[PDB]
Amino acid sequence: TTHTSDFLKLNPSSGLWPASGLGQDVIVAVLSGIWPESASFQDDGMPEIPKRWKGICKPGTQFNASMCNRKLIGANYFNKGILANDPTVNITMNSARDTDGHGTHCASITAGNFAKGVSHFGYAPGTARGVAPRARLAVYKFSFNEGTFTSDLIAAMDQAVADGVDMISISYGYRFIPLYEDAISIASFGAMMKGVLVSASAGNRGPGIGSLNNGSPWILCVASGHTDRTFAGTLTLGNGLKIRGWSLFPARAFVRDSPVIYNKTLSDCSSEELLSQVENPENTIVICDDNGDFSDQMRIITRARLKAAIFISEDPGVFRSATFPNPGVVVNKKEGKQVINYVKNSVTPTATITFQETYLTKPAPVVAASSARGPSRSYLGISKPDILAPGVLILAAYPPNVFATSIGTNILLSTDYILESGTSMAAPHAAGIAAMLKAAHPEWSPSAIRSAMMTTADPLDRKPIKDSDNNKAATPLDMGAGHVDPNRALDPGLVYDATPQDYVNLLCSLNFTEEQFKTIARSSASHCSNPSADLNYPSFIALYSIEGNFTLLEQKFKRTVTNVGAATYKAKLKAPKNSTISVSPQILVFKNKNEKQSYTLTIRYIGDSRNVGSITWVEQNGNHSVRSPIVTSPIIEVW
Amino acid sequence: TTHTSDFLKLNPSSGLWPASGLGQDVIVAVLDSGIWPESASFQDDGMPEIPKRWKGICKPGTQFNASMCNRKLIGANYFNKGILANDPTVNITMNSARDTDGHGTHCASITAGNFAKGVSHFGYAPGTARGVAPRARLAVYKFSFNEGTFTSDLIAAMDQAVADGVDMISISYGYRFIPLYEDAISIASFGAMMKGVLVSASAGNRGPGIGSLNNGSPWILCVASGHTDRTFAGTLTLGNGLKIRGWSLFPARAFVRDSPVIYNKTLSDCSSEELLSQVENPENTIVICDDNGDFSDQMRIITRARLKAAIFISEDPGVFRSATFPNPGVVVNKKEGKQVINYVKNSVTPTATITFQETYLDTKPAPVVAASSARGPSRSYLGISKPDILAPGVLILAAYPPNVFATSIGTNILLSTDYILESGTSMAAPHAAGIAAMLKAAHPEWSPSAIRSAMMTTADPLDNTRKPIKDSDNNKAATPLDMGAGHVDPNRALDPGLVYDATPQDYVNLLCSLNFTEEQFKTIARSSASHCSNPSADLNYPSFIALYSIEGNFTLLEQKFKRTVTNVGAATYKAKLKAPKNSTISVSPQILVFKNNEKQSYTLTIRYIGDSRNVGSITWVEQNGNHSVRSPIVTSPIIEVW
Ligand SMILES: *[C@@H]1O[C@H](CO)[C@@H](O[C@@H]2O[C@H](CO)[C@@H](O)[C@H](O)[C@H]2NC(C)=O)[C@H](O[C@@H]2O[C@@H](C)[C@@H](O)[C@@H](O)[C@@H]2O)[C@H]1NC(C)=O
Ligand SMILES: *[C@@H]1O[C@H](CO)[C@@H](O[C@@H]2O[C@H](CO)[C@@H](O)[C@H](O)[C@H]2NC(C)=O)[C@H](O[C@@H]2O[C@@H](C)[C@@H](O)[C@@H](O)[C@@H]2O)[C@H]1NC(C)=O
Ligand SMILES: *[C@@H]1O[C@H](CO)[C@@H](O[C@@H]2O[C@H](CO)[C@@H](O)[C@H](O)[C@H]2NC(C)=O)[C@H](O[C@@H]2O[C@@H](C)[C@@H](O)[C@@H](O)[C@@H]2O)[C@H]1NC(C)=O
């Protein structure tokens, strides 16, 4: 977060920040605790706490009722699930204090206060701050070293909603269970019913189809993108050749004019014995061929105590990890050829590598290969995930007394700020943005706010955003509407709104037993005479069975769009491959603010493979562009 | 130097700094392995224009061009003819004033480094770095090259510096085992002195044996090295709550928390690689090392064995001068070492936690004379007490070339840095030189000798506890042969009241009394004086030494010293005497009255007997004021001279 808000174009001059006061008057809850004494959680520029708030600072182990402030305004923890499970347990950290790190990291990403002069062992240096630097923090810890319990999770969410939180951020997910057994979904439904939007991670079991979790209609489901940041061990050869490779070695290693060797017998870097046969290992650099297992090469290299290693690799796994315990660089295939060449055509080939360099990459963003993919096996009906946000190697606060990274085989390091990857990092970005949107428009519903963020998202990086796993254009099942564009989201022109009743009607059309229905609903609605699955959503999915012959299919979607800008819009269409689409009316006229207008989209398609297209309502006498993606998809095994 | 000027009490409010403008109008030359110009210490952010007086060049060379200078680094010159003449076949890789070693960059920043924000030695000693004289001008003269260092090049560098009109000279080099007329630094220094330029030189690091110093010449400011009050911590906490502030300089934020500790006499020696290789799960276990007089070997065996960490029991002063700490660990004293071992023996599942990158400014006592700081008396010239003065020289933080080996982690990882910790009289001298330079800026007419006088008679012989400064090698009171007059006290030195002055002619007369052949005489004096009808060894010096042969029977001896003291303050002083053990001293007159630059002479007389170097002093304390002019006295055997 020393760059992330810049990457999002956020700034004090104009856009969401000024409009929202950096979220000072809004409150975002974060469902493993927090390390309160971190700089990210101090309150230097914070105005008084809004009267509305009455949340507690619940005492516990190494945590007392004065631990809160105008920034970290609430702290609560929920451990009854653990105890009920086994009253024999001694909970070491019986409070909201974080002993894992995940909770601290997420909290600072979403609403970390400005923190000067931080870095990840020299990388990504600068001032850290949350996407919403003045948003209020309410911590709810349900994850403990001794266990994490579904019911505790739900108890935490319910307490947060009950506390009057403006937004909820949760970087957890469960798979393989139907909605009426899905903890986060059950609680989210409740949150939505009460006007609180929930941001949750899509999960990290990508890139296989339908691999995401938290894919519920009443949740903002967030996928993870790379930013334009990179970390360098600049590689210079004895012949002047200079290459900006990749490195995250956590110290200013000194490797200058050292002997480089390339030996096919060991070039694999998979044999400890072989590597142990290179003389003067401590002053020599070895080249490692691409063998699809970098982290094993790094381990063998680290164990053998080589000066450094040059790794040839383009495996996306490499660029999401901060594990770099031994000096070395990673280079792509072409570059790897240049290097090997230099070595073979020389006696006395040498190399120099420097570290702790950080640069601000094309193209970006890119969908992380491991970001889980739609459609939702919780509910195929509605396209997921919703939106893309930065989640690869993000810098945020961290507990000073836990393992952070490693040097050599025997040295562990700790830190105040660490780089971390995952949809876990992305979600809190969205949550903060959502919170600022809500501060700018205090009347906007959870659904409208998700709408602003979506129809305003950018699907381009100026080409279509790529999927890192295959290098082809990302789908809405990869990135939803696209990369969050906070500033635009401030002024979307049209929003696809929805009400609590609308979700009840949706839940109702699912045809669960009334007991299952009650499980999810539980006390926000009763068993519901107007079932309706066509929930007013800012995106479109068209599904097709794969059980037998494929035949031309057709689908019709009804949408209502309210004007938040008098204005008129013309629909522009781009039909998914091998399909046709049509809308009606083709034009929407608006007399004045708040007026609502409906339309119907119709797709005619055939299955076999997920094709994409879209529909944009572009303003004729203005610069508003309301975009909604469209995707066809097979009908897959649901939970 | 993130603390060092604070340790010396220097500040912008009052004292030497304001009085001198932090040395902005003065110039100090560093006879060097050169310099790394692009360092933050050598930028010119607060620097006024370069004084017109200066006409020194920015001599081009390898990777160094004529624009490499600025209002801070105002001069750069190098001298390599000695190398070439010795062998024209040589290819000098860095043929310029650019530093490829580091020593020169370190010394330069210590003496006149500009304020540099947010620096540290891998997390230790963090803060703003600055020279003892943050606005002094730098003139670099490089005579030391990777391919060689030549006496004649050294002399050529000094002469060029004097010729350039430098105000002060700093040189952290020394040679031993040679008579004055073969002593390069002395020869050149005589020339510098003759022309009103004081030379600060290190006393050397072959202490603590007697007469081990170099640069012990009457016309040189000979500087010894002290510890400061700074310490570096791996706080050690045991599983039983016991918390110990041990010593550590591991160059990263290692994470060692609640780890298993073992104490096993069979390997507690930490000298067997094989033995240590027998401890299972070495990567998660902490081993205790007994005191065996060779810590650095223990550290090597531990590092090679890849233990989580080690707890070293040691009080060896060698440990506290080194930044070599490639593996997590702590060093504890003997008592603490007992507590730890106890805890371990009386427990199953003993554990420990160590944290790093902690730095404290609380140490008592300080300063302390470094065990390795070379000791008087001068085998160059027993006649005059050496060294002259004490200054911070142990683990000093200063600039360093970014592209050279700095320190180490594990057996295979080398690190580099912009600012490094370094120990030795090498670090002390540039401290004195900067102070001398500021004194000269405050009093533009003061001679080199007067300035050395101000620094000496104003030096403090007591430590932060108000006891007499200790010798780290034995823990007894330091001698003037260990620390000269004592620890520099810049602010006081600004207003000494009385100075023991001297003139170029005075040194000629001294040189003359040495009775060298006239060729030898010419070697040293070369062209500043001619072969000298008023020989005189009683050089007007701010200290006293009384020598006694050890060749046979010891018999009551007597010595008389004549001193002249000029008043730099109308005032009157009464002499207070403290006679060295087993001896008597007397002065006359016992009182000095001053009407208004007036000069007044007196004679000190010691009656002593040899056997062992005893110390005493003579202080001229002002009756109607707060001036105190102190001069140490020391008896000494007469040892083999060079
Ligand atoms: C949870 O903490 C308890 C203390 O609050 C532990 O029992 C206390 O444990 C002491 C440590 O062995 C023991 O000296 C005390 O007699 C005992 N007394 C009480 C009432 O706390 C408990 O440890 C378990 O129960 C104790 C009594 C022993 O039987 C241990 O062997 C058990 O592990 C702690 N529970 C756990 C699972 O750690
Ligand atoms: C390339 O790969 C191997 C790295 O271990 C080297 O072979 C090994 O050489 C060792 C002595 O250098 C020897 O003890 C090992 O038995 C041997 N291992 C194997 C699998 O052969 C090889 O060195 C070359 O080949 C060996 C056999 C000797 O003939 C050496 O003199 C050769 O340099 C490494 N280097 C090269 C240039 O192939
Ligand atoms: C001193 O620098 C010279 C020029 O850079 C070196 O001579 C040159 O070395 C090159 C590499 O061997 C070679 O391509 C050039 O033809 C050669 N000659 C000239 C005029 O440049 C010189 O290297 C030494 O002398 C050469 C001729 C070889 O015999 C080497 O063995 C020598 O090292 C450098 N001298 C040294 C001591 O490095």
Ligand SMILES: *[C@@H]1O[C@H](CO)[C@@H](O[C@@H]2O[C@H](CO)[C@@H](O)[C@H](O)[C@H]2NC(C)=O)[C@H](O[C@@H]2O[C@@H](C)[C@@H](O)[C@@H](O)[C@@H]2O)[C@H]1NC(C)=O
């Ligand atoms: C203290 O150190 C001894 C030397 O390392 C340990 O003995 C060594 O134990 C190894 C297995 O632990 C074994 O492979 C080595 O051959 C043996 N070496 C020597 C010189 O004794 C000893 O460990 C104890 O005694 C040994 C023989 C085994 O029986 C272990 O199980 C014992 O712990 C050391 N004793 C310590 C921890 O108590």
Ligand SMILES: *[C@@H]1O[C@H](CO)[C@@H](O[C@@H]2O[C@H](CO)[C@@H](O)[C@H](O)[C@H]2NC(C)=O)[C@H](O)[C@H]1NC(C)=O
């Ligand atoms: C003298 O050395 C300086 C130091 O670089 C040269 O200036 C640099 O030139 C490079 C071009 O290769 C630039 O990238 C650096 O930023 C320049 N820095 C500046 C502002 O000096 C300078 O050009 C050299 N002059 C000559 C005549 O060689």
Ligand SMILES: *[C@H]1O[C@H](CO)[C@@H](O)[C@H](O[C@@H]2O[C@@H](C)[C@@H](O)[C@@H](O)[C@@H]2O)[C@H]1NC(C)=O
């Ligand atoms: C709890 O918070 C911190 C963390 O332990 C404690 O240091 C506080 O100690 C007590 O309050 C502070 C303000 C100080 O006066 C100290 O001396 C007290 O013991 C504690 N704070 C409170 C409000 O209990």
